[PDB]
Design a protein around this ligand. Structure first.
Ligand SMILES: *[C@@H]1O[C@H](CO)[C@@H](O[C@@H]2O[C@H](CO)[C@@H](O[C@@H]3O[C@H](CO)[C@@H](O)[C@H](O[C@H]4O[C@H](CO)[C@@H](O)[C@H](O)[C@@H]4O)[C@@H]3O)[C@H](O)[C@H]2NC(C)=O)[C@H](O)[C@H]1NC(C)=O
Ligand SMILES: *[C@@H]1O[C@H](CO)[C@@H](O[C@@H]2O[C@H](CO)[C@@H](O[C@@H]3O[C@H](CO)[C@@H](O)[C@H](O)[C@@H]3O)[C@H](O)[C@H]2NC(C)=O)[C@H](O)[C@H]1NC(C)=O
Ligand SMILES: *[C@@H]1O[C@H](CO[C@@H]2O[C@@H](C)[C@@H](O)[C@@H](O)[C@@H]2O)[C@@H](O[C@@H]2O[C@H](CO)[C@@H](O)[C@H](O)[C@H]2NC(C)=O)[C@H](O)[C@H]1NC(C)=O
Ligand SMILES: *[C@@H]1O[C@H](CO)[C@@H](O[C@@H]2O[C@H](CO)[C@@H](O)[C@H](O)[C@H]2NC(C)=O)[C@H](O)[C@H]1NC(C)=O
Ligand SMILES: *[C@@H]1O[C@H](CO)[C@@H](O)[C@H](O)[C@H]1NC(C)=O
Ligand SMILES: *[C@@H]1O[C@H](CO)[C@@H](O)[C@H](O)[C@H]1NC(C)=O
Ligand code: NA
Ligand code: NA
Lengths: 353, 352
């Protein structure tokens, strides 16, 4: 099987597991060939432990697994327990999946409260693959008050069967123009289900379908999206048997284009205007799929709009000594891709003299 | 401006020429020769066609010099069709040839006996520099082989030019194939009105409305346009007082893109497929604004479609020993710009 698991018989370092000294406190290695100081109900062997007695409420210890950069589907099994001699809640065991050494995001699997003196088994299935990479982090958040122990053991990276957790298919990237509604659709083989933003709030389910005996679907709707919503999003589902985690798909938000500069007059007669559009410099996003000129008489009740694919445009059979307003509209792909009218050129034709 | 003619010194002095592939020539009448024509015919110097000397349908063409002007202008001319016995001498056609290209159908014609007096008409052509046009006076002989067609007093005027309507600029139109297209013309003035195809049939009006006290609008619909319809179109309006003619606007028909070849399999496992899209080769028209991969289980209860902007794509957590169909969709701008799905790759995952 792939590397990255650990039994802790030789300690965490032999498994390339590391702890940052700037976290509140360290996970402690429990080992055979060491004096048994723990309560006798606690399991024998070698594993990792956190003791709430030595610490204040909310202090966190984090054990960081080596980076995983695999091509084939795989899963991670681990054992955990939360124990107190008098049944207290020792805290929460959080599991974080950090992608591409970036933001940690919120936990994708957690258990809180007393479980017992026996090991419980859980499975992680993360749809993160080469060339992308991820770290699993085991986070213990302590309740305080000498409330017992949080412990983990027997980490294994497996290629089969990997059937204790649901599996997400590939989540596609989404691109929309600003102000348009966006939707992420997740498909999973195989209780709680949500869409996780890389650095932001978690989005609740809008819709769910059971599309097959083996496969179901869930939809997440983001309304009137804004350039600040541009981030990576991934689906997460959790059960007591384990969690499934999808790939971080990207939301791209595009701004409909409009020109920076107004049109300019290149030439004019009594009945014609020759105009330079100046539409090459814009605010917003390309590609420009349609460039339109609208022109109006300043007294006019109506406006004439033409598609133009040239730097210059010419208008004719105009009235002499008449003042016109000319604007350019720019269009990019998709709904809402037509921008706001550009800044106007206001000029007039020559007179009858 | 120059380009008119009184015909006092003849057609050659005005740079008026006749087409060598014409059936016969216009004849110059001069005051300098004895008036051999019927005395009812007007005196002076002008151009004439005698239907008696010719067979039915023989055509004579007198071609004016090229006009490449800026600013509104118009062409006035005098005409008559005369017979001693009131017979129909034929048809006087006026053709406006743009950019030395195809002549297209007449934009003004009169047929039948008019009388012995000159009648006056005006042309307004919205073709301007850098584009150019020729006016052609065409005489088609009636086949009753009797009477005369005559023209006189050609004048190019910049003002007032108020006997014929003037079209504003007609914009080019671009649509994807199978979509409906519309040309809209705006004209000044108060009649017969149509959209003229340069090398093709003339299209009748779909709708007409009043947008202003001085200007009116007309709309022409072409349904389910096809690459055969890609041509230049111009608006023409005609009255007994004259004609107005717009610029030759272009209809562009685009083909929605689709790939030539199906996707190919680069790699496969029990639960994944790695696919090469092969979408760089297409039959439609660019630009490609959206490239999509769709994949489905052959049981086809559901279909998954992803936007992909890379030569290769990977699908994962598929079921082992199950068959998948994968297609690539390409999209270009505008309504109907989504092409038909590409050729499918049909393959299955391994079994382990
Ligand atoms: C066990 O795991 C679950 C799943 O991760 C976890 O639930 C999540 O908890 C976090 C908090 O740790 C939630 O995130 C917050 O949600 C509230 C609304 O309920 C927001 O007000 C918060 O906003 C903060 O962050 C913003 C970042 O942009 C700031 O702008 C803002 O000002 C706030 O600082 C924050 O988004 C998250 O929504 C839930 N998700 C779910 C699905 O429940 C749970 O907490 C874990 N349990 C333990 C004990 O750790
Ligand atoms: C006077 O001018 C008008 C306008 O140009 C002429 O009408 C046009 O005549 C042509 C034929 O010369 C028509 O084209 C034909 O259309 C039919 C279908 O209608 C098609 O079957 C033929 O193959 C050909 O394409 C054209 O449609 C028609 N346009 C209009 C608006 O009527 C008219 O013929 C001229 N009269 C004379 C005596 O020259
Ligand atoms: C994951 O795959 C990448 C890409 O390699 C391709 O997939 C492999 C399964 C195999 O079929 C290769 O022939 C393919 O080209 C691996 O990246 C390559 O790794 C090899 C060996 O270390 C190296 O020589 C190449 O330079 C790497 N890059 C490329 C573009 O081939 C990667 O190592 C694989 N990782 C795991 C954990 O399997
Ligand atoms: C119509 O206007 C254009 C723009 O001025 C004219 O084009 C120029 O004409 C002059 C001669 O008058 C040349 O020296 C220039 O080389 C032409 N090009 C440009 C870009 O200036 C055109 O001649 C005008 N024609 C009429 C009949 O008015
Ligand atoms: C988004 O969806 C809501 C649903 O009520 C709708 O009112 C709104 O107009 C939608 N906006 C866009 C841009 O589609
Ligand atoms: C085109 O117009 C016809 C009516 O002439 C209509 O039936 C058809 O649906 C239209 N097609 C499109 C694509 O608008
Ligand atoms: Na162990
Ligand atoms: Na004369």
């Amino acid at each position: 099987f792939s590397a990255g698991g650990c039994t802790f018989d030789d300690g965490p370092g032999a498994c390339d597991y590391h702890q940052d000294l700037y976290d509140d406190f360290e996970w402690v290695h429990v080992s055979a060939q060491e004096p048994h100081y723990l309560p006798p109900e606690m399991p024998q062997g070698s594993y990792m432990i956190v003791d709430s007695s030595d610490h204040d409420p909310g202090e966190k210890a984090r054990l960081q697994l080596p980076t995983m950069k695999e091509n084939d589907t795989h899963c991670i099994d681990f054992s955990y327990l939360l124990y107190s001699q008098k049944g207290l809640n020792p805290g929460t065991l959080n599991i974080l999946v950090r992608v591409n050494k970036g933001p940690l995001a919120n936990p994708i699997w957690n258990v809180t409260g007393f479980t017992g003196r026996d090991w419980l088994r859980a499975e992680l299935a993360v749809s993160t693959f080469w060339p992308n990479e991820y770290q699993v982090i085991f986070e213990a958040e302590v309740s305080g008050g000498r409330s017992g122990y949080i412990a983990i053991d027997d980490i294994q990276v497996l290629s089969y069967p990997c059937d204790k957790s649901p599996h997400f298919l590939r989540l596609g990237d989404v691109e929309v123009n600003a102000g348009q509604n966006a939707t992420f659709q997740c498909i999973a083989t195989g209780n709680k289900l949500w869409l996780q933003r890389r650095n932001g709030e978690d989005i609740p389910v809008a819709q769910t379908k059971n599309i097959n005996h083996r496969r179901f679907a869930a939809s997440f709707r983001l309304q009137e999206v804004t350039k600040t919503d541009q981030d990576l999003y991934r689906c997460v589902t959790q059960s007591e048997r384990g969690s499934g985690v999808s790939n971080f798909a990207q939301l791209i938000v595009r701004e409909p284009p409009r020109p920076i500069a107004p049109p300019q007059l290149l030439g004019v007669g009594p009945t014609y205007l020759l105009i330079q559009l100046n539409a090459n410099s814009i605010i917003g996003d390309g590609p420009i799929i349609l460039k339109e000129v609208e022109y109006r008489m300043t007294s006019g009740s109506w406006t004439e709009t033409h598609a133009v694919n040239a730097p210059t445009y010419k208008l004719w059979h105009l009235d002499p000594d008449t003042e016109y307003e000319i604007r350019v509209l720019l269009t990019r792909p998709g709904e809402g891709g037509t921008g706001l009218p550009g800044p106007p050129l206001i000029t007039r034709t020559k007179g009858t003299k």
